[PDB]
Design a protein around this ligand. Structure first.
Ligand SMILES: CO[C@H]1/C=C/O[C@@]2(C)Oc3c(C)c(O)c4c(O)c(c(C=O)c(O)c4c3C2=O)NC(=O)/C(C)=C\C=C\[C@H](C)[C@H](O)[C@@H](C)[C@@H](O)[C@@H](C)[C@H](OC(C)=O)[C@@H]1C
Lengths: 543, 529, 540
C-alpha cells in the first residue's frame, strides 16, 4: 500500500529493546508559577542603589530576574541619544543575598557579557532608532526623546535548568540589590545639550520582576553555583593576577580602553546603525563637510594651521606621496573646488612622519546643488578604518602633537559627541582590533596555557554559539546542574593558588593617535561555590 | 568515591522501526468554503509525525497589480484537524499554527517568502504573466513532533483523517482595482498534498500520553472582555489583539512587498505620497480635488503649514515651471475647531533634482516623522463620516494605485504589530483575580522564555519538560465556581483626531487545555477534569 | 506576593522532584586546548599530518584547523572565496594504528557546517577577505595577511565528553588540501603563476584534549559518509555494499571542465541573489549605454550599437528598451548596444540576447568624470545569467560572435574555481531534478516528483540550504544504537541505486551547455571497539 514492499519484508524479536515510541509520563512536583513584580527602595551611596526584598511564605522558589526601567522624557536643546542596550549599561553591580550573606553577585559588564549572545534580551534592554539614534532639540521645550520603558534580563545560574536550577527560599529573606552607573555612562550628547541640569533631574525608576513558584511539599537538595570575579590590571600594564583560586570552572581574558586622559568627546557616532561600516561611514560623512569645499576664492572659517589647496584642472591634489582625486559636477563659474590637505594631523617630531586623515582619501566625487548651495557626495574612495572613528578629539589636540591637530571648522567641532559607554572593549568601538599578540596563563610558577592566536576565543565563540566571545579557558565540560562542575584543583603549598595572566601587546606607531589610548587587562574567574539550604540559604567557597 | 561516567555510555538498542516519507493526494470539497480530506489507513503505518502540506499556486496572467501575502502557505490555512473513528485527536486554527511557527525561519521560508511571490508585480496586457506558478510547503507543527519518535501519533489498524479547511483566496492576495479579482476568485482552486514521516514499528509497545489542545475565543468588535468557559486543566493562556477592517474596503495607500522591515513599510508610504506631495508644474497643479491646498514654495524654500515648517528645494527646475507643495495631502479632524492630523505636516525636508529627459522629479533626501501606524491606516478611515474634512486629497492617479490587503493574521493596530494597545491586563480564574499587569511583562517573559521576537501576553503554567512528564496545569474547582478564565483589558488612550483611533479591535484569548491520549480500542482523547 | 486564588488551588501519589536534583560526582578529568604544528607533504596535492600521542591526553573532540593566509602583494584583481577555510579542505581522516577511524570529503564537512553561522564566519567570511581587491603597483598590498579557523565537525562532538574520541594509542589527523586555484577569485592582470608557486598552506590543528583519571571506556557507534560522483551528465549513480545506512543525500554539481572558469561578474562579500544580479547588471551597463560624439569605437565589428531616438525607445526585435540619460553634451548622443551578449545554434533561429533582458535605463552624464551615472534600471536578469561562464558565449556551438563587449570590460572578467558549487547557478536556486528514484537492491525504496525530502532535510536540521536526504535514523544519537536500513545479501539487496530525471533546458540558452554531476552521499554505520587500540568495524 502506502509503505513500500522492500520495507515490510526488511522487518516482517530475540533481543531486549528500549522503547523509543512511548514513555512513562512522570508525575512532577505539585507547583504553581506566578510573574511577581516588586517596587524597590532607592538609596544614594552618591551612587544609585535599588533594594528589592523578597519575603513570602508561599514564594518557595524563584528564577528569571527582569529589571524594568522607566526612561523619562528628554526636553531641551542640543544633540542627545542613549547607548545601545541602554538597560544593561545602567547596571553597575547586582547582588542576590540572604540573611547568611551574598548568594550570588555580578558586575554590570559581566551580566552584559553573558547576555551578548541573547538577541531577545539585548532588544528588550533598549535597542531601537527611537532610543539609540542621536536626536536633536531646537527649542528649550522641544522633545529630544519620548519616555520609554526598558527590560533588563538579569541572567543568573538559577535559569540554567528552569525549575531544577531555581533559587529555593527556606522561609528566608532574599534581597536583590542593584547598583547603578551614573547617567553619564548611558548617554551620548554634544556641548549644546544641558547635561548639568539633566544629571540633576534624572532619577533611575526600577522595578524587579521574577518567576515565583509555590511548591507543595518541596524536597530541597544542595546545589552548586559559579560566581564571577573580575580583576582589572593597572593602566597600560600587560599583567593581572587573580588570587585565592581554589576551584575555577572558567577563566576569561579581555582588554578595555581607559579614556581618563581624554574629555570622552569623539568626532562621529552612527546611532542605532551599529555595523563597522556604519561607524566608518558616519566619520567619513562628518569629515566631508570640511574635506571638500566649493567656495568663491579661498575658504574662510578654518584655523591658520589649516592648508586648503585648490583642486587643479587634472583633478589630482598631491599631499606628499598620497594622491587625492576630487571632481565635483555643476560647480558655478564664480566658484572653485578646494581640498583640506591636513584636516586632522599628528606628529611627535618637527620634520618626521605625519598621520594625516586627508591622506586616507583617494577619490571624492559629487555634484554641487544650486538650490541648497551644498555639495552632494556620490562616491568616496578611502582607507578610513574603525580605529580612526574611535580616536577621542583630545588626542588630536594633545601636548605630544607638534602640529595643531584638529584643523576642522568651528561648526564641525561643535557637532562632537561625548561617549562614556562603560562596556567598551579593546581599542576601537567595534572591538575589532586584537591588540593581544600573545597570551600566557600561569597557575603558580608553571604555565597553564599559552597561545599566539585567539584560538581560546574561537573555542568560546563555537562552544557557546556566540558571535562576540572572549579569550576563555573552560575547565568544565560536564553537564550543568545535574553534575558537580569540573574545576581546576589548586595546590596552596606549591604556590599554585593564584592565576597570573600575561599578555604581549601589539606594537603601534608613535605618530598614530591610537598609541596614546591607555589599555587595561581584564581577567574574569568563575569560582565554584556550594549552595547549602540548612538553616537558611548560604554559599560556601570550594577549597 | 562513586563517580558517574561522562566519557562513555551504553548504546541502548531501540525499538525496531523503519521511517518513510509518505505523500497523499486528498479529496476537495466546498458550504461555500474549500476543504481537503486526507485519509491515512495502512496496517504497516504504525506511527506518524511531521505533517507538511504542499500547495501548487497557479500561473497568474492578466492586467493590474498582484502579489501573495508573506508566508502565503500559512495564511491559506483556516483550520486543521487530525481525527480518528473515536473523534478529533488534535485541531488548530490557521492563525494559531502560524503563531506556533513564527519562530521557525525554515518553516516560514518554505511556506512562501520570496521576491518572486511577495513583491507586488504588474500585468500590462491581458496575456502578460504577473506571477509564475510555484509550489509552497506548509509545516503543520503538531504536539507529535516535540520528542520525534517518542511524541509521534500511534495508529495501529485505526483510520486517521487529516482535514484542512482553507481561507478564501482574497485573504492570501494583495491586488489593486485594475486586477480582475472577480475572474481570479472563480478560476482559483487550492491544489493540496499532505506529506508525513510514517513509521513501521516491529512489536510496538504503546503507553498512554498527554496532549495540549489550543482553544481560541474572539471577543465582540471593540469589547475589552473575553471568557474561555470549562477551563479545568490549562498549560498556558495567551492574550492578543486583532484589528477588524469590516467598516473599511480593506484598501491601503502603500505596501512594500517582500521587504518586510518597519523602515521598508515606511519608505514605501513616503515613496507613494511624494508623487503628490511635491509637484513641479507650469502654474498651479491640476488634477487634485478642490479641498486640496497646494502652495507654491517661496525663494526661501520654507513652506509653513501652521507651526510645522517644510523645507523644499528641487534642482534643475525649468524657468517656466515652479515648485509646489501639497499642504494637506491627508488630513483628519472630528470638529472644525479641533486638532488636525495632517500627513504633510509630518515632513520637514524634501530635496531632489528635476529630470528634463523623463519630465519627473527624482527625490534625493527626505526628512520626515512618518511611523508604522501611518502606513497601516485604511484609506476608508481618512474619508470617514467622523472627518469634517475631505480626507484623501491625493491625485486620481495615486488613489488608483491603492492595494486591497486582507491578511487574516494581522495583530494589533499596525502591519508590523509594533504598537501595544493594551494599557492594563486582568485575568480572572472563576471570579478571583489570577493575574494583573500594567506593563507587558508577561509578553517580555514569553519572548525571553521562547527566544522569540514576536510574542504575546502569555501566562505559562507548565515549566515541566514536555512528553517525559505529565504537564503542570491550573487546577479547577467547579463547586467554588473556578471553572473558567475571564480576560479584561484596558485599551491605551489616543487622540480622537488621529485616524487610527477608528480601527475596530478584537480581543483574542487562547487556552491550551490538557487531554489524555488513550490507545485502548483505537486512538481517543479525553479532557482532563 | 502570591495571589489568594493560587494558594487555595494547592493548600499518596509518587512524584518526581523537578525543583532539586542530586549533584552526581562526574569522572575526574581535566580539559586543555592543545594546538599542534603538522608535517607538510606533496597531482602534488598539499597534505598535512598531525600526530596525537600523549600519556596525559585520554580523549579528544572539537577539531579546529587554523590557516595562516599570507600577504598578497602585486597588481590586478584578487579575492578569496566565501568561507575560504572550508574550501581549502579536500579530505580529512582521523586514523589509528588499526586504520581509519573516521574520514570526510572537504565538501561534506562544509555541508555539515552550512547551518553553523559561527563556524562559517571563523573560516573566513569578511569584506577584508571576500571582496575583490585591486593592486595597482607591483608592491601594492592587495590582501593583508589573516588567520582563518576551520571547525572540523566530527561525530565525537555530538554529546561533548560522552561522544569524545578515546585514545588511551597514536591518532593521526591527515588533512588533504585543494589547490590554491580553488580558493581564489582573480583576473588576467593578476600574476597567478607566481602566486601558485609562492603560496604554501600553513596549518595548525587544535583540539580539546581531556586527561581522565581512571577512564571507563565502553564501545560506541559512528556514522561514516561515503560520496559517489556519477559520470558527467549521467542521471544515475550507485552506492555499493550498503548494509547499515543511517541516511542518504542526493544533490547535483556543475562541471566546468569545458570552460576556462572565467565569469563576467562577482559581487564579493555581498552573497545575496540580488547582490549577484546587481554586480552583473553593473558590469554590463558600462558597454550597454554609451554617451559618445558619433558612433562608439573600441567594440567588435559584430556589435550593433544603435542611437537612441528622441522617443527614447529602441526596438531590439519584439523587446523594447527605454533609454533616457540627463545632462548629455550638445556634441554627444545616447547609444545602446543591442547585442552585448548573444547566443544561437542556427543563423536565423531563436537568439538569447542579454540586451533584450533590459526594459528601462535612466541616468545622468557627469561632465567632470566624463562617465554616465545610472539611477534606475528595469531588467529581467536572473541568477542563471550571472552564472554563465564566458567560454560558453564564445563557444563553437554559437553561430554569432557571442561576446560583443569592449576590451576594457573583457579584461575585468574573473576566474572562479570554487570547489563546493551546487546546481547550475552560484546561489543553487534552480532546481534541475524533476524526479528522484532510489532503489535498494532491485526494489524501489523511495520515489518523489517534488523536493519533499529536501523540505524535510531543511526542516529537521533547521538549515536554509539542504539536500534531497532520506533519513533512516530518528533515534537519539550516542545514547542509542542508530536505526539503519537492513540489507539482504541473498536477495541482492546490498546496494543503493539513485536515478534522477533532469529538467531539460533550451539549447539556445548558454546554461544548457553547463555540464552536470550527480552526487550521492551514504552514511554507513560502524562500531567503535577499544580492545587493543581504537578500531572501527562495518555493521553487516
Ligand atoms: C541535561 O540533561 C541530562 C541530565 C542527566 O542527569 C539525570 C540525573 O537527569 C535526567 C533527567 C532530568 C532526565 O529528564 C533524563 C531523561 O529524560 C532520560 C534519561 C535517559 O537517558 C536520563 O538519564 C535523564 C536524566 C539523568 O540521568 N530520558 C529517557 O529516559 C528517555 C525516555 C529518552 C531519552 C532520550 C535521549 C537519549 C536524551 O534526551 C539525551 C539526548 C540527553 O538529552 C539526556 C541524556 C540529557 O543529557 C544531556 C547531555 O542533555 C540528560 C537528561
Amino acid at each position: 500500500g502506502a509503505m513500500n514492499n522492500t520495507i515490510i519484508n526488511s522487518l516482517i524479536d530475540s533481543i531486549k529493546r528500549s522503547n523509543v515510541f512511548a514513555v512513562d509520563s512522570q508525575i512532577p512536583t505539585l507547583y504553581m508559577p506566578q510573574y511577581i513584580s516588586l517596587s524597590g527602595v532607592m538609596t544614594n551611596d552618591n551612587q544609585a542603589i535599588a533594594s528589592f526584598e523578597i519575603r513570602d511564605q508561599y514564594i518557595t522558589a524563584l528564577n528569571h530576574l527582569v529589571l524594568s526601567l522607566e526612561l523619562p522624557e528628554v526636553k531641551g536643546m542640543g544633540r542627545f541619544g542613549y547607548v545601545p542596550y541602554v538597560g544593561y549599561k545602567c547596571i553597575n553591580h547586582v547582588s542576590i543575598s540572604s540573611c547568611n550573606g551574598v548568594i550570588w553577585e555580578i558586575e554590570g559588564e559581566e551580566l552584559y557579557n553573558n547576555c551578548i549572545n541573547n538577541t531577545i534580551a539585548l532588544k528588550h534592554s533598549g535597542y531601537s532608532s527611537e532610543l539609540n539614534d542621536i536626536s536633536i532639540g531646537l527649542t528649550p521645550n522641544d522633545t529630544i526623546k519620548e519616555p520609554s520603558t526598558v527590560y533588563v534580563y538579569i541572567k543568573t545560574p538559577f535559569d540554567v535548568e528552569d525549575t531544577f536550577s531555581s533559587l529555593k527560599l527556606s522561609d528566608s529573606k532574599i534581597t536583590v540589590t542593584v547598583t547603578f552607573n551614573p547617567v553619564s555612562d548611558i548617554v551620548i550628547r554634544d556641548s549644546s545639550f544641558d547635561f548639568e541640569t539633566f544629571n540633576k533631574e534624572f532619577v533611575y525608576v526600577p522595578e524587579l520582576s521574577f518567576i515565583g513558584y509555590m511548591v507543595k511539599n518541596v524536597q530541597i537538595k544542595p546545589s552548586f553555583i559559579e560566581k564571577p570575579r573580575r580583576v582589572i590590571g593597572q593602566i597600560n600594564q600587560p599583567t593581572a593576577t587573580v588570587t585565592e583560586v581554589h576551584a575555577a570552572t572558567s577563566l576569561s581574558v579581555y582588554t578595555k580602553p581607559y579614556y581618563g586622559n581624554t574629555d570622552n568627546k569623539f568626532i562621529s557616532y552612527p546611532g542605532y546603525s551599529q555595523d563597522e561600516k556604519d561607524y566608518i561611514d558616519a566619520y567619513v560623512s562628518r569629515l566631508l563637510d570640511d574635506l571638500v569645499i566649493v567656495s568663491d576664492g579661498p575658504p574662510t572659517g578654518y584655523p591658520e594651521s589649516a592648508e586648503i589647496v585648490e583642486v587643479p584642472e587634472d583633478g589630482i591634489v598631491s599631499i606628499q606621496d598620497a594622491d587625492v582625486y576630487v571632481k565635483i559636477d555643476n560647480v558655478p563659474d564664480n566658484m572653485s573646488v578646494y581640498l583640506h590637505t591636513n584636516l586632522l594631523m599628528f606628529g611627535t617630531r618637527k620634520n618626521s612622519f605625519i598621520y594625516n586623515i586627508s591622506k586616507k582619501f583617494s577619490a571624492i566625487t559629487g555634484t554641487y546643488s544650486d538650490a541648497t548651495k551644498r555639495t552632494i557626495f556620490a562616491h568616496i574612495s578611502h582607507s578610513i578604518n574603525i580605529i580612526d572613528t574611535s580616536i577621542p578629539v583630545s588626542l588630536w589636540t594633545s601636548q605630544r602633537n607638534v602640529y595643531n591637530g584638529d584643523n576642522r571648522s568651528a561648526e564641525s567641532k561643535a557637532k562632537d559627541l561625548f561617549i562614556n559607554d562603560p562596556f567598551i572593549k579593546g581599542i576601537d568601538f567595534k572591538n575589532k582590533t586584537d591588540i593581544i599578540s600573545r597570551l600566557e596563563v600561569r597557575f603558580g610558577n608553571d604555565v597553564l596555557y599559552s597561545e599566539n592566536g585567539p584560538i581560546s576565543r574561537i573555542y568560546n565563540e563555537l562552544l557557546t554559539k556566540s558571535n562576540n566571545g572572549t579569550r576563555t579557558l573552560t575547565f568544565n565540560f560536564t553537564p550543568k546542574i545535574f553534575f558537580r562542575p569540573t574545576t581546576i584543583t589548586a595546590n596552596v603549598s606549591r604556590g599554585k593558588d593564584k592565576l597570573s595572566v600575561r599578555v604581549v601587546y601589539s606594537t603601534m606607531d608613535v605618530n598614530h593617535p591610537i598609541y596614546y589610548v591607555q589599555k587595561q587587562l581584564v581577567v574574569v574567574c568563575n569560582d565554584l561555590y556550594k549552595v547549602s539550604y540548612d538553616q537558611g540559604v548560604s554559599i560556601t567557597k570550594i577549597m
